[PDB]
Design a protein around this ligand. Sequence first.
Ligand SMILES: Cc1c(O)ccc2c1CCN(CC(C)C)[C@@H]2c1ccc(/C=C/C(=O)O)cc1
Ligand SMILES: Cc1c(O)ccc2c1CCN(CC(C)C)[C@@H]2c1ccc(/C=C/C(=O)O)cc1
Lengths: 233, 233
Amino acid sequence: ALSLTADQMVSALLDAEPPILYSEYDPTRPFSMMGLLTNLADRELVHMINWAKRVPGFVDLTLHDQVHLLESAWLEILMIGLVWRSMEHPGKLLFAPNLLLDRNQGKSVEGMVEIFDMLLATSSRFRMMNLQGEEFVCLKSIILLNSGVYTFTLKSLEEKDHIHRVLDKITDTLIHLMAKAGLTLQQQHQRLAQLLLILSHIRHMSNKGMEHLYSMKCKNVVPSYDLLLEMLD
Amino acid sequence: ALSLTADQMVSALLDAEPPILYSEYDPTRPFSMMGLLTNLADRELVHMINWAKRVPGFVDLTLHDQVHLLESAWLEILMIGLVWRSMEHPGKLLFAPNLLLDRNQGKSVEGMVEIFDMLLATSSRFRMMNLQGEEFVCLKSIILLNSGVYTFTLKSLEEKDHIHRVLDKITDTLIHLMAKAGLTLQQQHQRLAQLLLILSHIRHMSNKGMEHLYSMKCKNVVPSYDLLLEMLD
Ligand SMILES: Cc1c(O)ccc2c1CCN(CC(C)C)[C@@H]2c1ccc(/C=C/C(=O)O)cc1
Ligand SMILES: Cc1c(O)ccc2c1CCN(CC(C)C)[C@@H]2c1ccc(/C=C/C(=O)O)cc1
C-alpha cells in the first residue's frame, strides 16, 4: 500500500469505483422524495463498504477503526459522489440516472432546499475547476481516511501514523496527476490547495444533513455502529 | 494585495494579529463556565472584526460579502486561536491566560466535554506537526476567506474570483515558508495537504458548537447579521 507507485495508486482507486445506482420507483406511475432518497442511500451504503475495503491501506487498519472512519465519513462520501455525477448537469442534482432533481423539487421537504443549494454550488465549483476523474477518486479516498482520524493505546498511535502515511501517498499521487497534465509547480500547489479546501465545505454539508437526519428521530434512519460493524465484519 | 510578495504577506498577517484576552471574573472569589466563555467570545469578536479588516484582500470585497464571510467563519476562527494558544499545554485548553481548563471542567455543561475533546485532539495534532506561527496566521486567513465562499450577479462572480486569487497567494506563501525552512518539494506538498486537511476538522468542530449555541435559543447568543453588519460598517 505504501509501496505503491502513483500510477498504481490511481489504477487501484479507479478499479475500486462503485456503480451508479437507480432510484426504485415505478416509472409508469404518477410522481415521497425522502422515501426515495433514503432507499437510494441505504443501497449505496452497501456498495460503499465494498469500495472502502479496496482503498489501499484501509484493510490494514483494525475493524473498530475501519468502522469509526466509515461512521464519520459516509454522508460526505455520498455527497462528493452526487456532486461529481451532477457536474455536467447545471442547475440539477443527478441523485440517480432516473432521478434528476432541481432545487424547486427539494422545496418539498422543510430544510432540504438549503442543502440542495449547497450541493449545486459545489458541483458548479467542480465544473469551473474542470475536475478530472482521477482527481475525484483521490479526493474521495482522502475523505474516508481523514474525516474520523482526529476523533479516535499503542495500537491507536500506530493506526493514526499509518493513516497519515497513506494520506501522504494520495497527496503525492494528486501532484503526479497534475504534473502529468502539464501544470507548472506553482499551479500544482495552487490546485492541490483549491481541491482540499472544497473538502471543508463537503464536511459542512454533511454536518448540516446529519442534523436533519437526527432530527427525524427514526431507528431506520442513520446507520448504527452495529449495522456498519456487521457489514464490515 | 495580489501584488504582495510572500514575505510581505507574512509580515502583514503577523502585524494584524489580535491580542490574547483575559476572562472577566474576580480571582479573589471562589470558582458559570458558560457565562465566562460567552463573555470572552463576545469580546474576542470585536477584535476579530479589526483583524479581518487587516487581512490583505478582505476590505476589497463588498460590505455584504465581508459580513457573510465573518458570519460563516467566526467560531472556526475563535477555535483555531484556542488550539494554537493551547499547543504547549498538553491536556488543557488555554481559553485565556487566567482560564486554563481540562476536559473534566468541560463536563459541567451537557454536550461540552465532546467539544473539549475534539479541541484537545486538534491541539495535539498541531503539537505533533510542530506548527509554526507564520503557518498559523496563514491558516487563519484561509479560514476567513474560504468558509463562506461556496454559500453566497456580475459583482458576486468578480468577488468569488478575487477571493480565489487571494487564497492562491496565501497558498504560495505557505509553500515559500516551508521552502525557507528547508523542506524538500515532496515534503512541502505533503505538509501543505496535512495543514489544509485539519481545516475540515475545524469546520466540523464549529458546526458542532453552533448546534449547541442555537439549541440555547437565546437573543444574546450567536452574533446576528445586523450586529456583524454594524460592527463592520
Ligand atoms: C448524496 C445523497 C445520496 O447519494 C443519497 C441520498 C441523499 C444524499 C444527500 C442528501 N440527503 C438528504 C439530506 C437531508 C441528508 C439524501 C439522504 C437521504 C436519506 C438518508 C438516510 C440514510 C439512512 O437513514 O440510513 C441519507 C441521505
Ligand atoms: C474557542 C472559544 C473561545 O475562544 C471562546 C469561547 C468558546 C470557544 C469554543 C468553545 N465555545 C463553546 C461551544 C459550545 C460553542 C466557547 C463559546 C461560548 C459561548 C459563545 C457565545 C457567543 C455568543 O453567544 O455570541 C461562543 C463560543
